[model samples]
Every structure is written in C-alpha cells, then in structure tokens.
Target: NDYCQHFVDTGHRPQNFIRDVELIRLKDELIAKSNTPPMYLQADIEAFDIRELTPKFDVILLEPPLEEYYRKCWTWDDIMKLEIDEIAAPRSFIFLWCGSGEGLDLGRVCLRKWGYRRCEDICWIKTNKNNPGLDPKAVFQRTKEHCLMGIKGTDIDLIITEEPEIGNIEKPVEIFHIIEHFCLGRRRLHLFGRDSTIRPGWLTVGPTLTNSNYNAETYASYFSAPNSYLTGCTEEIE
Candidate 1:
C-alpha cells in the first residue's frame, strides 16, 4: 500500500521492481571478492556517506520512500546536497517522484536546494478500467502521482508523458523510456529503487529491506556484475 499500480494493464512494462535487499552488503561482497577493481559501488541511500559518490550520473531517478525524515535518519537535505548534487553530471536529467500531500511540498524545497529548475511535471494518472484507484471519492483518493522533472546544466524540454501508476512504489516504464530517448549517455542511476527490473545500462541503489522474494537472484546478479553484462552494448561479430 505504499504505491499504486494501474499502468500494468496497458502493456507498458514487464515490471522493473527491485527486491528489498541491503545495498552495503552487496557492494561490500562484490568488492571483497574482486581482485582488480569494483566497477560500481553499491550503497544504501540512507546510510551511505556523501564522500562515496565521485563519478557523475547522466540521468538520475529519485523516489524517496515517502516521509523518510520522520522514520529514517536521511532527510531531503541530504538528498539534495549530498546525494543528488554530488552525483549529477554537468548535464543531467533528474526524475523526482513525489506524492500529493507533504511529499509535493518537500519536493519543491529539495529541488531548489539541489539547484534544479523544474522544467515540467510528468503525471501518472491512475487507470480505471482494469484496476481502479482507491476510492476516488475519498479526499482525492490520490488518483495521480507527480514526477517533477528537474534539469541541471541542461536546457532541453523533456517530452512529458503519462502512464497508469502500477504496484507499490513502482514507477511506470513509459516515462523512463521517454527520458532514455533523450539521454545521450548510458550512465543512469536509480535512487531508492523498489523495482528489480531495469534497463540494460542503469545502476540502481537503495536498501533492499523487503520480505518479498520475487526474482531475488536475478536482482542480486545485477549488483554482482556491475561493470559487465547488461551495462552497455557489446560489439556484434558478424
């Protein structure tokens, strides 16, 4: 009940939800086993230090698990200054997901702190045919969610798109692919990822603190082979 899912019925995706697995454990394990060098550093968004991020990201996706400040140690201040700003490249596209209530309010402030000028808002409208939203009559029933588009050191207008919100804390693949179309680089990052399924070349990081065990092995494999396989396109031998 943390997120919604109506977009699945529209054939928008096969689902890119990540399992609730600890990130530091995976990152540490990978580094410990390797002799040469670790390609990517797996880290929990909350506990990870800002000093850890050195490389920049071309496209960044942030979906903070809602009211994290109240329950967790991490706050929007850390996300804006330490996490988002430190990792975002000179020209990067940041997709910040926010809910309707206090989430929306905090999103505005955090974006400003990170120096992101909002370009547009991508709305995920809940589909009604196959799966209806929770009681449309109940004080907005939250039939929609907003992904505030924040661009840093870039000036291109993103093509706004929409999809049905599907599953808990799962974002629609439609908007993600749209951003992918505009991105010239392959380096992408997902902050606070709840879905295991991702594009071939994207790096996802967050605390895998869930009980669900669907496709856990495959998700773990992604962390294991951070630099190889699925990272980028391989040359074809014909």
Candidate 2:
C-alpha cells in the first residue's frame, strides 16, 4: 500500500534497520574518542570583556542570532559594537553568518570595521529532511543561508550542503573542517555559541551554555606545547 508497508513486507526494513543503527553507533564512538577536548564559557557576549582573554585567536566564527524572530535577535548595530579587532591575530580569518536581506550588505561593513577584507562567500543549501515548513511571511521559500568569510591580513582561502536541524539555528559541522584545512592556526574562537556548538579545540562562549570551564591560562597552555592535543591531532588534507 505504501513504501513503508512494502519495505516491511519484503523484510527490507528489518534487514537494513539494524545495520543503520549500528553504523550510527560506530560513528558516535569514533567521534567520541577522536579530537582534542573543547573549552567553553557560559557568559553574555556583550557584557564579557574579550580583552581579558589572553592569546589572540587565529580563526574566529561568529553566529549571531540575527534572522530568528522567535529568539533574541541581534540588530545590525549590536553586531557593529563588537570589538573583533582587539581579539584577532594579525593574520587571521573570520567566518560571519550574515543572515539574508540587509545582512548581505551590512556584513561587509562589519568586516571593514573589524579590519578584515571580504574574501569569499560560503553558502549552506538546506534540503528538505526535517522540513521546518515554509515561512508564511516570505514571498518565496528561503532554502539557503550565507556565511561571509573575511581575512584580516592575507593567505586564507576556502569554502557546504547540509540538512536543516530540527531545533535551534545549528550550522553544519562541515564548515569547521573547511576552516581547519585552510588555516593552520590552532587558537580558534566561536562567539555566540550554544551548547550544541561546543567542539574540541575551539573555545566556545555564549549565554546559552549551561556551564563554563574557560580560564585564560588553561586555554593558552593547551597551545603552548609544540605537539599538543590540538596541534598534534589536526591532520592536513592531502
């Protein structure tokens, strides 16, 4: 009668389901053991003095809640207020998630203010996996998000397709892989990060985090080793 029924009747579902479950478990175990553990801080980005943190970051990722109407959205002015220049290294890269519409133009302004040049545009094309439904307010069904890449000094270049997650504004993890491949810097920063955004190596900070373990000294110490967890584990793409 239906695809589900057909699969069940043919015994395809029973045969394939177990393997699929096992594959996911295997992948989880692989990820759980691999990579350096991450450090995080549960703090309001606006209130927290970024200058207090020692050691400038080589890569900075900013995912401001700009487009979401249900959540606390940040205005363009709020984004401009951030003193990104103070925390970024002389040779660094910034990946900014500039929401559609006016953000397309305003994102460039923020880059200029932060002392970075507009280098590239990375797009996340969403597929209809979990389908959040069409926006009633929009003229067309918006199926994509833009991330503007900016370089502070020079010598940074890179570039996703991912399904939209069910809850919260979660970006695809592939973007991190792209960043790691192009930029050699181990000191990375993620601003306005939620608990889900927390990953190994990067220092994530945001109000939504449940707890904090961020200390300037401890974070810097991880990178001090010539063959530390962060540096030693990071593999170069061939």
Candidate 3:
C-alpha cells in the first residue's frame, strides 16, 4: 500500500489520517450541532438568478462537471458565467473543485475573475481498489483530484485525502470537514451539488437534485436569530 510504503521508507507516521467510520461520525456530529435547517433548490444554475437566495453566504463550494470526466460538461465560459460574486459575503471563502485537467488553470482564472485571491490547494489522493490499468494515452496513472481555495478577505486554510466513491462525480466527505473547520459561517452554499451531497446547514443548488424546498424568505429566516450560526461565528486571520 502507498501508505505503508511511505511509513516504511520514512519511518514517520502520516498525520491527519482519519478512519472512514470516524469521518462519518464526525459528519453526523457536525450535522447534529447545527441548528440551521438544510435547504436545496433544484433549478438550472445557468438560468436561475442566485441573488434571490437571500442573505449572502460566508462559505461557497463549487464542483462543476468538467469535460475531462463527464460527457455533458460546462465549458470554461459557462462556468465563468455564474454570478457567484453576488451571493458571496464581503468576507468569505470559495472552494472550487477544479478537475485535474484544464480546470487547474481555468479555476484560478475563475477565482480572480470572481474577485478572490488563491489561498490554498487541496488534493484528494485517491487509491482505487479495482486498480483500473493506466490509460494507454496518458503518461502516468492518474490518482488525484484538486480543489482550489480562494478568498475575498482574510481567512484560514486546510487539506484532505480520501478514496473516491464508485460513482462519477461524488467528492469525499472530508472536504466538508475542512471547510467547516476554517469557515465558521453557517450560511454555506454548494453549487452544482447532487442529492447525496445534501447536508444540514448548507444550501445546495443544482439540476441533478430530485427536489427543491428553497424559499428565499424562509431560508433567510433560519439565519435571522441573533445567536444564529451565521451571525455569531466570524472568521479571523491568524
């Protein structure tokens, strides 16, 4: 195993290694701790006006289907067209799951275009059990994905490592943990999210979701309480 090889070669234990059950438990605990109800909007992001979604979010996550992996994908221009800036807080963080291909560069362009500075790069080192042989056309066997973290104002940083799910577009749950750790703002938005990715305290919007219960006013009311998660926890740079 790669993990074993690293330990045997270096005689140093890997840090931040979390078991799957523990990760699931941690996700449950976070969901239980949050009082804000989860919300979702099943609409075409390209046509929908996100500004109607009420109060701006302090944390936003974008995971577009890149042409490299999906048959039907958003072009770089289509991705750039979203009005992410309108829904982002004055001081906020954006985690963009850019594919390992052209996305690495274009994602940065999107960040700068959306008015955020590149802060950190998080890689998901995937070790598949089935071990599909290396691509005949590629130079090396691919085993990683990248997520770029951009910030409009001062904020924190983090990373993650996990195996990929059986399906095509599911990202590791660990990514959410990293986001929650750094950004305390509970008004989180996940763009291009699937039904399985839905979680409490986040507003998910995508065409793939099975349903929609998003009412701008009702959604905004959840964060209206003075001691609400959105109002109380603010990010501070170290």
Candidate 4:
C-alpha cells in the first residue's frame, strides 16, 4: 500500500493514471500519441557499485543473490583491482550499470579487465510524453541510456556496424537470433528481467527486503531440483 499511501498523502484526487506524470495531466484532454515502443532489455542498476563482482560469472545479469547468501555489495572495479590473475581475472559475461554521467571512463577500464569486448550498445529514447507543459528541467524531454553486450575473452566475435548505433534496445529480435546462432546454445541469464521469452537463467531482484516472493520460488523451482531443466536464468551458459 506504499503507492496508495503516497497517492493519498499528496493533495491530488483519485485518478486513473498510466504514466508517471499522468496524475498531473488527468483531464479529458484529447492529445496526440506516440507508438508504444517494442520491449527492450535495459540493465540499469542505476544506483549500484561493481566492486565485488565475482570472477567466474558468465553473466552478472543482476545484482548477485548475495543478500541472502552474503552480507555485502560487489563492484566491477573492485573485481578488476585484485592485481593477481587468480584474483583480478574476470568472469565470462559481465553486465553492470552506473547512474547517468557516472562511469564513462570507468566502464572502458572495467570492460578491459572484466572480460566484455564491447560488442554493441543500445540507446533508450524517452520522450517528454508524460509532461505536456511542465518545466523544461523538471521534465526530461528525452533521456538516452546505453547497454553494452559482449562475449568474454580475446577471441570474441564482434557485430560491428557504422560507428553510430544502428538500433536501440527496443529491437531484440536480432539479439535473440545472434545469440541463438552464435553462443552455441548455452543457457542465458537475465538479471532483474521478467520477460517470458527470456527462456531460463533470468535472475530477478525486488526492492522490498521483507517480501521475498521473487527469490524463494526461483531457488527451489530451478536451482534445487532433480528434473529442474530450467537453470541458469540468472547467470550464463555454464
């Protein structure tokens, strides 16, 4: 009821809203609409650190399932600074994020040490659809985000297009095809993802600490079983 509590606490009346700013635009106003873009995979751990990333990960898709297993957070930087190959060497498929304008150079350094070969990036375009007449600064007219996917190691195959991005995250059909064709059909993991087509190895995390619904089932359903063919939804081909 946290949503409802915040809604009630605010001075706005009850309204049926869709976008984050719909409460402000809740009137019988006819307006032009934009196409709802295709679903895209964005690994925006916008407020995260990558210091404690594990060396053996195929895909550090989401934050690791360490809260229940360990008592700390990890980062890519910390993983790279280990100095010894036995310690600093990276895992297979590394994925992590920095908040807007945070780790531009750090990403490059981390990628070099941590395995990803910087194959391709996708940008997410956010329109100012939510705010019709809001302040320019308050309403981010458009927000662009990036994602880099790679194969771990030096012999990695690259999907090089013209320097500028050829497509955005909204188109994943090619990704599915390329991955299916190239990766030798290893099981994949999607951290914090909920898309049904993800097949297996999708690790998900929730904001709530008390409500552990997301974790309990997946562990028993996929990890701890005899006929559990659905494994690795959280990490990689291994």
Best-performing candidate as measured by TM-score: 3
TM-score of each: 0.58, 0.73, 0.77, 0.37
lDDT digits (tens) for residues 1-238 of candidate 2: 2634645455332222322112444433433343346988998888878798668887899988875523256898898899999999898789998865667789899999999998789876554423322555567445567889899885123222334444557787777766655634777889989899898868898889998988988887756645333432344222
Could you arrange the candidates by lDDT from highest to lowest? 3, 2, 1, 4
- Native-vs-model 1 lDDT? 0.53
Give per-residue CA lDDT, model 1, range 149-219, as digits (tens). Answer: 88888523222223334434556676655565453344566676644543345555666634323232343
Off by over 4 Å in 1: 1-42, 67-82, 131-139, 154-167, 209-238
Error of model 4, residue 99, in angstroms? 3.8
How far in Å is the alpha carbon of 75 misplaced in model 3?
1.5
RMSD values for the candidates in order, in angstroms, are 12.2, 8.6, 6.2, 16.7
Lowest lDDT sum, 10 consecutive residues, model 2, at 13-22
Residue clash pairs of candidate 3? none
Residue-wise C-alpha lDDT for candidate 3, range 1-238, written one tens digit per residue? 5755564455333332435522455544544465367788898888777687768888899988776654247888899888888888888789999866778898899999888898798887664333322335567445577889889976123333434444566887789867876635778889999899998778999999999988988887766655344321342112
Clashes (N, CA, C under 3 Å) per candidate: 12, 0, 0, 14
Stretches > 4 Å off in candidate 2 = 1-36, 67-71, 129-140, 155-167, 225-238
Global Cα lDDT for candidate 3 = 0.73
- Top-lDDT structure, candidate number: 3
- Better structure of 3 and 4 per lDDT: 3
Candidate 2 yields a Cα-based lDDT of 0.70
Order candidates by TM-score, high to low.
3, 2, 1, 4
lDDT value, candidate 4, whole model: 0.33
